[model samples]
Target: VKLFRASEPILSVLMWGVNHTINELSNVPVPVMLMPDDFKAYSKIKVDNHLFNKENLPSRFKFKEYCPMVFRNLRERFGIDDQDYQNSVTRSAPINRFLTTYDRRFVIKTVSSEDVAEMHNILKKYHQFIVECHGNTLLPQFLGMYRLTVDGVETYMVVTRNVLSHRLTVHRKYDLKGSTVAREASDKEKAKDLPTFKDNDFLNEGQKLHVGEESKKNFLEKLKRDVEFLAQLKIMDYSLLVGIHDVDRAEQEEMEVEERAGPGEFDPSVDVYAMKSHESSPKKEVYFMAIIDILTVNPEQYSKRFNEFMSNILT
Candidate 1:
């Protein structure tokens, strides 16, 4: 019997997948050290319901988890408890397309098979990088990857910690690739309430992130290591995803939140990629950042350019 319910078919499958995977993981003994086989290991399950919950769930579906053990370990290294991760996805329906879990704590992204292969190619190095940094880098904290099938249609998704805060309202966002060549938000895209601007837009607007001296130093240090690691892997075209949250707007929203949820607050342990703006800055805000879209392949030259451009944006 399933312990939780979800309204959407995709979400119902996700909840079922998480619940099933976590439970299965509990029975497997933790390894002393991950082996080459571990990086290539996966967990797969197919669900078929004839007359049970067919109204809300697909009558037949399949789910596949890549490197389940590795992801479970990655979750722990990133300071997320297995049960908490399970509860977050299973508690309710995730929102938006390619969805954010109900609490907005995790993003389930649709990816191609090629992306999956790239992930596998980088998995070992990425895991080592996470270990060396003690899970403190701005790179995407991947929690899990799964392929779900509904009505014989298969969809592959990767789960990562959301770069944006779950509690804060993002007033602006940017996908900066550190290259100015043909990089800007389209007029149609800019028409959205929260558009993802690009490098040219960022520089032209003289946008700077006021994260204070200490935060700036720590951020840059991590960025250098992360990009260097990426460079070593010969990966490029990854973007530094920047999200800005207005404190003034947050304050107003908090008032509304307090009435029902007590207060708007975040758990840094869970929302691990968020940073607050420096108090002395022109505006009170919070900034969320992480390296994203890491499935590309190119020469290492882009990493150096990426670092220099991102560094100039700080302080």
Candidate 2:
């Protein structure tokens, strides 16, 4: 019914060992932002304390490892192998079933096209780019989602490996590896000089806009996830993709509170892709999600809702 921390230290450490796996061993190891308790599902640290309880730890660990093994084997024939993970990011629902850790890379998303013609036009323009572009980065190669009847919905359908590369430049190590270069432009620039404006004569007016080393990384990461989530959920068609918030120390503290609250209690990780109070420059990069879509004229309109969402997930 409920998962508890191990009373013994030996058990805790052992559990960590079993669950902790090296997904890749690059010459340059990706900097894994370890908030063991935050991203519970993928974290070996939290798994030791919760889900993998003392008695069930061994079995649960074995069972989990086996299930993925079986699934991977069966799916390999379809090209869903680990090799494909380079382009297709993998995401898992957190320890809390209701939540998930959205991989920035796999977040290639598209919205519900109110008019079939509009959908065709955008796809005609960008579909080729989406398909031909291949690497550990970029939008998803496979576009997928279910039909929606409402104004919109958001879904997660693409398969992608979590890319440490698609991080907010503000929150990442500054270097010459094109980290300072552009990743994704603001909404105004995305449409090029051409007009794809739908709402008004002066489109993107009053919308928050920024293009920089940090904003670029945020945009690329947010765009991938947003497009995928929106398309899969059959949500509204919106424009301009980028990260809105970089998780700051305050959020990290919030995450700590959530951890103490227990599994499935509530989490903040689920509330990704929305903008947050902009902190121009801080000693360290703030830990926040990217701003991907501006559906409302007032972007801050959802601030209250987002806080509530964060609280719910952080419980």
Candidate 3:
């Protein structure tokens, strides 16, 4: 039986793929250790239905998973349970575009074949870094990568843990690359509900993230290590994905329930990337942050410039 339903054909396909992948993983034995070839392995499936569930699905589709064993290990290292990852996607249609799962527990991004190769290029080193850090860095937690073909169209996707909170509403967002060269959001972009403001935009607004001494120390420490790793891999163009949740807005919606539960408060366990503002901060806010788009760009001097700029963003 189909455990879930979806309105969109693509979403239905995604749900089916996740469900299928998890079930297949269940049957595979867990080796004592992963092998080098696991980083280069993949699983491909082609579905051609003659007369079945065509209402919400295409008659024919293909799904390919890249480095499933490696991704499985990555997920485990990142403290994500395979069952939970499976449930999050299979339970509902992930929201569209740089899609967030309905529960916002994960993000699914479309990438090019080049991006896949780039991922494969750094995967071994990336995996080692994750192991060394014990999954404590701000780097993206890549959970899975797949390519889906439907109606003769090929779509590639990369799944990672969302840098934003699942339960909190992000009133503002920024994509900071630590570069000012034409890095600001356009006026038209700012007109959107949540524009990805950039380095120049952030500086122009005189914005400072007041996460306190402890958080600043830890955050910068992680940032330094993460950027160094990217530089070593000859990768750049990554951005710090920042999501801000306004306490006032949340309180306005849940004023009546203040006595029962604190408004805007989130569980750190669930929203792993989130941080609370210092008590003395002007605005009561929670910030969710992580590194994103690490699969592309140049290294060396870029990394140092990136580090210096990001170090100055927080107070």
Candidate 4:
């Protein structure tokens, strides 16, 4: 009943599209297994001359979901219930190409037509890799892929679980790669409110993610498996997107606004990537680490270096 609404007219269409697709999936029974045909299937909906529904959205628009069943299965495997997923989008207007759901549980990123083509190419193998891992890896958890046609314009988009927390604020972040060749945030980037620091910036700051040896091993093992798989796929130019939440600092920041915070508190289920700092460490903090932008088709050389660089950053 929540007519999809957003700041941008196109975004409203996005919401309506997701709302429509999930409802259709609800009627379709859960498949015993995904068939090859499922990956190739799509669902298209056209809304034209809906004069009664022209209050907030275009009267004429089109929505196409590529491989809806595949994405639905992926969403389930990623621990996202279809109902909750639909609620998150259909209930509120998403504020990007890089914006999260109003609840901040999911991120909707605008992808190029080229990206759509690439996703189709590697999706089968990628799905197998995720199945083998049992959805336990550092790679981005893709939930949906869609195409919206408004006024004859095709806007491609993809949705994934937010790498950062849905609640806790990420005070510091770094977009690190294995390279050292002038690797640092540009002055222009540094001028931003929250700049994406690079490898050199991280090293220059002399930062270490001290998440205890126990937690460290867990991250490394998963990353090792993750990059090894990427290497196998000949796709290894992703960045290790790291975020730090100084829990103590968060309390003060929140204090300035509503003035409340528990000591390093967060839901373990929701903040899956978060890890508390070591007991004997200098400060109490929660760290978020994940892989992003994994589109390159490099080999073991890059993956090895990438893996090593990430390993060095942790305690």
Candidate 5:
């Protein structure tokens, strides 16, 4: 049902009191997990074939799985204990807002009450949002949402899963924190359009492999194709969910900072740093996966700020 504005006689006093109390509420670290191992296992959960069903998407995070157990705890906290939930009956949905990391994503959502009270309107709209964007890109996928009560407060949490494995950071193939560019290729393993340096191979086997200048051209062509494939996923036609409204919202929030947050307010480096903070190639992939967390919740805000930054960078 639409939450119509009712002209109640006590509206002023009630609104004033609630605003004051909520404003005074301390920041609560609900249950966000930050362990490196936890995220790695979650990203590499073997996608089963025989037991898989389209309807089984929610249950893909199995009970024994650490993620599912966490989900179960979140569910139980909100008083939802029906084992028959395999059918998607309860609408106490969890919204997967954005990815924080390949291993540990962040969700800002709410749970349902004992009577299944907040069941229809907001939920129907939420699921509709997911149904509308099934497979536009590998960057963002909708895993659904859940609502639960934690410590007497009705809270909501969303789950946004990543396509890449979070193990990218743990395996340590790439460096994130280093600001230095990769060194010149000592030798080329494959060259046609551009040089292809076998850094991993060289590390594994003590040998040099390099291609001449002409073959570097072929490599460049291949690289161009690969990049285009990923970039196409970000275009307007293919990426419909990334609408103007979403982009505007994301840009505003992620890049927003108070004027009081001066240069020395926090870590100056972290203010606008991107994936460069990652320590390795794998970590970079994990970082890439988590970027969507900044996208889904307020896409428009994020896009706006990001675009401004890029413009400033170009200038």
Candidate 6:
């Protein structure tokens, strides 16, 4: 059994926390409905091993899971088995602050206290929205949240499913909004291996994602409803994260290095937000678009433009 080994104490503690909590939850009975109190509840554990267990864990540390019951149910609804989820974290180390599981199956983001507080405020409604949508929105699918204290420094982290294909490489990506303001990528940002371009850059490039009519209709419908939900939540300002994987481009890249999904193909279940290019499109590509941030508007006006701007970018 892996003991949550890692180069950083934070990653090690995170692995240990997930491994511990999931195991603890395994013995608890699942309730039919989440009580109001469950939203405000949490589970905490303290470990003090002096000289023992020091190889992986610190001599003293605390792990706290926020709204455990609510998140457990959310995980179930999202189709992530707790044991599988535990294995993803426990079996390996996550090298960065914003990290993906070793298998690229999940995303872990270190958040701030304010962000955690904000999560609590919208939790109930967010869970309700997920229920109504039947888990079909482009919104980030939150799986778990925790606060780990080591040497008295408290760090918070939230886990969500990765929006891009777990097995595909994103050749290029963009962060878009309908607004015309300062939306281009800075030179420094553009210099990165994967730069986050913006609306102005997108429009300047005259780029369009060509998915067929049915995909367009279904995508726009989902976008409209998703933004509307954001608007009602008084959440204003979010981006449509677009990732493009060019088939021929990747086919050549694969010759240099390998094991990705055959160029332009992805599992619908794993790459939930991906769509293939239409037969008539100029290039063969796979597009991944999702509203990763909590951004949105006039109770109705803002999200409308958000949807319209994004809708125009597709065929």
TM-scores for all candidates: the values are 0.92, 0.26, 0.94, 0.96, 0.23, 0.95
CA shift at 182, candidate 5, in angstroms? Answer: 27
Query: Ten consecutive residues with minimal summed lDDT in candidate 6?
Result: 293-302
Regions more than 4 Å wrong, model 4: 259-261
Question: Cα lDDT of all candidates, in order?
Answer: 0.85, 0.30, 0.87, 0.87, 0.26, 0.87
The residue-by-residue lDDT of candidate 6 on 169-281, one tens digit each, is 88889899787566899999989888889999898899988899998888988888888888888776788999998888888888767555456788887788899999898
* Cα misplacement distance, residue 71 of candidate 1 (Å): 0.5
For candidate 3, lDDT tens digit of each residue in 45-104?
998888886777788999899999899899999888999999999887777658888888
Measured by TM-score, how close is model 6 to the native structure? 0.95
Clash total of candidate 4: 2
3 or 6, which is superior by TM-score?
6
Q: How many clashes show up per model?
A: 0, 38, 0, 2, 71, 4
Q: How do the residues 1-315 of candidate 4 rate in per-residue lDDT, one tens digit apiece? A: 686768888999998899899999999999999999988888999998755788778899999999898998898888889999999998999874587899999989888998888788788888998899988899988899999999899999989888889898898899988964668899999998878898999999999978888889989999999988888877755899999989888888878888543678777677777788999988899988999987552487888789889999989
Pick the winner on lDDT between candidates 1 and 2.
Answer: 1
Name the candidate that leads on TM-score. 4
Candidate 5 wrong stretches, greater than 4 Å? 1-134, 138-140, 170-305, 308-315
Ten residues in a row with the worst lDDT in model 4? 259-268
Error of 1 at 266 (Å): 4.9
- The global Cα lDDT (0 to 1) of model 2 is 0.30
Give the winner by TM-score: 1 or 2.
1
lDDT of 1 by residue, 174-282 (tens): 8998884779899999898788899888888988888888878988999999999888888888999998888788788777889886223456776677777776878
The Cα RMSD in angstroms, rounded to one decimal, for candidate 6 relative to the true structure is 2.3
* Better by lDDT, candidate 6 or 1: 6
Candidate 4 local distance difference test against the native: 0.87
TM-score of 1: 0.92
Number of the candidate with higher TM-score, 4 or 5: 4
The reply for model 2, stretches above 4 Å from the true place, is 1-117, 131-142, 148-238, 241-255, 258-281, 286-315
